[PDB]
Each structure stands twice: as structure tokens, then as C-alpha cells.
Amino acid sequence: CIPLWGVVSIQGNRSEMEDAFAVSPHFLKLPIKMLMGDHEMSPSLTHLTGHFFGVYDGHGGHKVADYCRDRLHFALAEEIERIKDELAGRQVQWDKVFTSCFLTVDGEIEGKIGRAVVGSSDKVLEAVASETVGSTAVVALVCSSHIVVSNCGDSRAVLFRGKEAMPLSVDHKPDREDEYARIENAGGKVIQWQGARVFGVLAMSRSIGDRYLKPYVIPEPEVTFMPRSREDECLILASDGLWDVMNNQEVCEIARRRILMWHKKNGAPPLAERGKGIDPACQAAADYLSMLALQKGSKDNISIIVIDLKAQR
Amino acid sequence: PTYTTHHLAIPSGVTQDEFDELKQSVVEFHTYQLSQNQCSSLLAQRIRAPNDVVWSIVRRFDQPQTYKHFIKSCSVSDNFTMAVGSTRDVNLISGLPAATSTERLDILDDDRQVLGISIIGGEHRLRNYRSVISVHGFNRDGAICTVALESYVVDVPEGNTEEDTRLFADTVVKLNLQKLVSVAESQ
Ligand SMILES: CC1=CC(=O)CC(C)(C)[C@@]1(O)/C=C/C(C)=C\C(=O)O
Ligand SMILES: [Cl-]
Ligand SMILES: [Cl-]
Ligand SMILES: [Cl-]
Ligand SMILES: [Cl-]
Ligand SMILES: [Cl-]
Ligand SMILES: [Cl-]
Ligand SMILES: [Mn+2]
Ligand SMILES: [Mn+2]
Ligand SMILES: [Mn+2]
Ligand SMILES: [Mn+2]
């Protein structure tokens, strides 16, 4: 599994940059006992490398998104260290891991969880940003086995398989039927104030941070454990600065056509150097997707990670 | 000519014995003339700090960020004497149904510790918003606490109802009073 990705993250017409992203290739050594079950076929196969992608669309300030960029994947790695101590079910197992990981991060942002120190002493306990600051997070683990998506907010991950775009997450919007009921069963109110908004303020029902709207806006994520298929083309993570102006289906096809177009003109690149850094054809598609979003008129921050899932083209 | 009636109901967060005294300032300060398709509300917050340092924060018309939420930056107009008639340009943070706001300082009474501001422009759906904050000290067996009272009146925008507007406007004012607590008790 050689990771092929490209990224573009731009401020656009916004006065502040509050989108952030993180790519970490070869980050984790997922134990095979967490992906599939042995059958009749590789004794040497005991762990499997996972690559990390995350996009974080902050709101109210940048420090929560920046924190997610700098910390979320180490949080997740630690939670997978705790399950390496042992002591189907895999779907629920991943559900827990990412639920814990996002909850751990949310608490550190809020200042309710001590953050580790480098001098091996008392874990610093302090809020990372103000009360009104927050951030979406959509996160992808890709290994040769499976794709695992963990979503919290209205950033989105769309899988292009065959010819069908398949969103790997549902937007956490306040007018979504199940979220509307959940926010009232918590004592909160949703109103229509230039969009569905919790108490007329926040236009999303889930997030990282947003202390002042606990326990209405929660950091519990939707997690999807998806087996890979030979017909998978690409996986896209983005903030809504793209999706607000572009259809899931179209985004996914443009990405593919741009990757194909690149390989037609230049061929493949040296297999030795594939993997370390951005893939030119993935880069060229993220570059093309982002310029379309601007000229379609997106006035938001726009952040796109394009991931090519084909071994060969 | 109709008028707000907030003196008739003890607002959340105050004792009956405190309202006996507060009921007087409500009719004095927090009472508005009501135009059609408008609405109003009155909010109150007990602060464990002396009513002089509370007022000392509240009166800083040029540093609203200090005791209020949702402010990214606020700028006045160079030559500033903090006199009635002044104005301030606010930029809000992201993710709000608002982006800017022009505010004019209408009441500034250091003798009675009452602050009044009218919002006169910007990009947001609270047209004709006027607010009053009055600070009221108390003493109970040598324990000096402060009760702050904030009211507002605002036009109800097209599309929404009175209770949406109260629910949104109230939510922000409570939040802002809750921060003023934390800031005053910290000094
Ligand atoms: C945070 C915010 C959002 C809006 O939509 C309206 C406005 C921009 C005026 C405001 O600054 C509101 C300020 C309020 C309610 C009170 C105050 O300042 O005493
Ligand atoms: Cl902006
Ligand atoms: Cl910030
Ligand atoms: Cl678990
Ligand atoms: Cl609604
Ligand atoms: Cl195209
Ligand atoms: Cl090309
Ligand atoms: Mn944002
Ligand atoms: Mn939270
Ligand atoms: Mn949007
Ligand atoms: Mn956005």
C-alpha cells in the first residue's frame, strides 16, 4: 500500500484562515487482528500500515482546528496503543476507538483533560482556545485492507467506487431530523436564523471544542468501517467550502478525470520516488477542484485532500 | 403607545428581597416604548464582586471584548473621549449569523452605573437594537455582591417570530453576562 495523495488548502475571500489539514503517511501499525480474520493466508502478515488524513474546518477562531492538525492523530495513535494491550466486533471496536479519540481531544481543547508535558511531570490543564471556538473534523485511515472514516460536523469524505460516489459520512446539521430530536432531548433549541442553528448561533450539531454549547453540540462522531474494493477509484476529504458549490458526484469524477489526464500527458513517475510526498496527478486534481470552487464563487476557506486508490493507471 | 412590563415579573436569578430594590431601576431604566413587530426581554446576573469594579469593566465602551463574547476586533474612531454619541466598529468572529456591527454609546452614567448602547449599522439581523446595563450593589452581613441587569429592545426580522428573536438575543446576553461574572470575580 503506497500512499497517493494531493492537497490544497486556501483562505479565499475570508479575512481569516481557519481551515487546517494533516496528512501522515505510514503513521500507524494497525494490528491485523483489527482488520480481518485469519483464513487459509500469510504468516508474515501480522500488522498493517495505516495512513492518516484529516481536514478540520474551524469556526470562531483557528486554534481548535490548528490543534486538531497538530494533535488528533497522536491522540488516535495512543488509543490504538491501549488496545494493543488487549485484556463484526471490529466495526464497534473502531467505533469506540474514534469515539474515545475525539472525546479525548474535545476535552483537551475545553481544558477538562490535562495535556501532556515534555518534562514528564503534571499534565498541563488549560483550555486551548476561548469558549466560543470550535472546529469540524473528518478523518480517514487508509490501509491496504480497509478505509475507516470518522466524522464530526459538516466536512465530508466521499468515496468514488466504480461510477458511484458514496459519501462516507453524513453532515451534522442542526435541521437533520435525528439531530433536531437529539438537541431537544438534551434541552436545547434549534431555530432558523440565516440557516438552522443551535440557539440561533452555531450552524452545526457536532464539533470539536465549542465549550459554551456543551452538551448540545457534541464531539461524538459517525464512524464508517469500509472494506476496500478493486473498483475503488479515489477518496476525497474536504471542508464545505467545496461541497457548498459542488455536487459529490461531480467532484469525484473531476478528480478522476484530472488524475487520468495527468497520467496520459506525463506517464507514471519513478516507482522508487512514489509514496514520499504528494502524487503529481492527485495534486493536479486538488488544484483543479479548488480553482473551480473559487470561480463557481465560493467565498469560504476551501481545503481538499485527493487520494488515488488505484494501484496502477 | 405601548411599553415593556419587565417590572411585573421577577427575572431569573434574583431573590424576591433583591427585586424589591431592583424593581425600581427596572421601571427607571429597563422600560421601552414598543413599536409594532418588536420585542424585548430583561436579564439579570448575580456577580460575587463589588459593584464598582463590575461597573469599572462594563463602562469600557472601547474594550467590549474584555467582558463580551463573539468579538474578533473592535475599533473606535481615533479621537475618542468615551462620551455619549461615540461609536465603535465591531468585527465578529466566524460562524455566526453576523459579521459586523456599528454601535453608538447612548447612555453613560457613572453616577448611577448604567450603560446604554444602540446598534446603528453593520451586517446582521438585529435591526434597531438598544440595550441597557445597570449595575446594582448589595450588602448582606458584610458580604458585598453585585446584581447586573441588562435589557434590550429590537425589531423582529422578516421570517422569524418574537420567541426566536428573544431566544437568540437572550442566549447571547446570558453568555455575555456569564463572562462578565468570570472577569469581575477574577479581580
Ligand atoms: C454577537 C452578535 C450577533 C448578532 O447577530 C447581532 C450582533 C452583531 C449585534 C451581536 O453582536 C449581538 C449583540 C448582542 C445580542 C448584545 C450586546 O452586544 O449587548
Ligand atoms: Cl471574512
Ligand atoms: Cl482562535
Ligand atoms: Cl475500544
Ligand atoms: Cl429548524
Ligand atoms: Cl474534468
Ligand atoms: Cl494534466
Ligand atoms: Mn470555518
Ligand atoms: Mn465540546
Ligand atoms: Mn456551509
Ligand atoms: Mn467552512
Numbering used by the authors:
A (entry chain B): 186 to 225, 227 to 273, 280 to 505
B (entry chain A): 21 to 207
Please share excerpts from the published article on this structure:
In the resting state, PYLR/PYL/RCAR receptors display an open ABA binding cavity flanked by two highly conserved loops, named as gate/CL2/β3-β4 loop and latch/CL3/β5-β6 loop. Specifically, both gate and latch loops define a surface that enables the receptor to dock into the PP2C active site.
In contrast, a fourfold increase in the IC50 of ABA was determined in the synthetic receptor compared to its WT. The synthetic CsPYL15m receptor displays a similar chain of stabilizing interactions as AtPYL10 along the five mutated residues (left and middle). First, we selected a dimeric receptor and designed a series of mutations that increased its affinity for the synthetic ligand while reducing the affinity for ABA. Therefore, we did not observe constitutive activation of ABA signaling in vivo, which otherwise could be detrimental in the absence of stress.
